[PDB]
Amino acid sequence: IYDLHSHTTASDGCLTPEALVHRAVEMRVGTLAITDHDTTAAIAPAREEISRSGLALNLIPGVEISTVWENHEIHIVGLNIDITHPLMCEFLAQQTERWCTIEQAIDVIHHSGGKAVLAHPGRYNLSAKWLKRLVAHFAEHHGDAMEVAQCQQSPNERTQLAALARQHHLWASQGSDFHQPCPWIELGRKLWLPAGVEGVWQLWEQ
Ligand SMILES: [Mn+2]
Ligand SMILES: [Mn+2]
Ligand SMILES: [Mn+2]
């Protein structure tokens, strides 16, 4: 199971990086991305806990970047980024100082060696036509993937998003957006991709 969107006490999650990696293994998550808001501070302690505890969990370094597009707050997740790259650190420092554009987020992620993901597209409450414009804009500026699967989701939304991703030659991501234990969100829960779209992890696995 891949869960490529989660938070820790480094941003607005309630669990430490150490508690989260253990929760992921208990939930039978095989690959976990930590994607804290505008910080990578949880990655190094999470890796340390996986090693010290002998966990069989692949940690994907990630971040969730806050952007603005056409006056809408839009979140872009970077996956498999190099968290020590000076441009990434500078960019995140500018983010916590203050937003930036979608294209600017994508460029920093790519320069850091990662893949850019349009996060939770259904949450922006856009009409079908404006969601299409957002996705077309994201793809036009070299975005790589879009989150297709979430924990709380009608089957219709998931297949609509997968078709929208495929339409623009984007890969699909999946993530719980876990912040704290609660009824409606759990690490790995109900995350799978429908047929007709490939997972974003292909872009670094091969
Ligand atoms: Mn959050
Ligand atoms: Mn978000
Ligand atoms: Mn999030």
Automatic annotation (TrEMBL):
UniProt GO molecular function: 3',5'-nucleotide bisphosphate phosphatase activity; 5'-3' DNA exonuclease activity; 5'-3' RNA exonuclease activity; metal ion binding; nucleotide binding; transferase activity
Gene Ontology process terms (BP): rRNA processing
Q: Which cofactor is essential here?
A: Mn(2+)
Q: Which reaction does it catalyse?
A: a ribonucleoside 3',5'-bisphosphate + H2O = a ribonucleoside 5'-phosphate + phosphate
- One Pfam family it belongs to: PHP
Domain Polymerase/histidinol phosphatase N-terminal, by residue range, is 2-69
Q: This protein's superkingdom?
A: Bacteria
Q: Which InterPro entries does the annotation name? A: PHP_dom, PHP_domain, Pol/His_phosphatase_N, Pol/histidinol_Pase-like
The enzyme's main class, written as a single word, is hydrolase
Q: Does the keyword Chloroplast apply?
A: no
User: Which EC numbers characterise this protein's activity in its record?
Assistant: 3.1.3.97
UniProt keywords, alphabetically: Exonuclease, Hydrolase, Manganese, Metal-binding, Nuclease, Nucleotide-binding, rRNA processing, Transferase
Q: What PANTHER family does its record include?
A: EXONUCLEASE, POLYMERASE_HISTIDINOL PHOSPHATASE N-TERMINAL DOMAIN-CONTAINING PROTEIN
Which family is this protein grouped under?
A: Belongs to the PHP family. TrpH/YciV subfamily.
Protein name stated in the entry:
5'-3' exoribonuclease Rnm
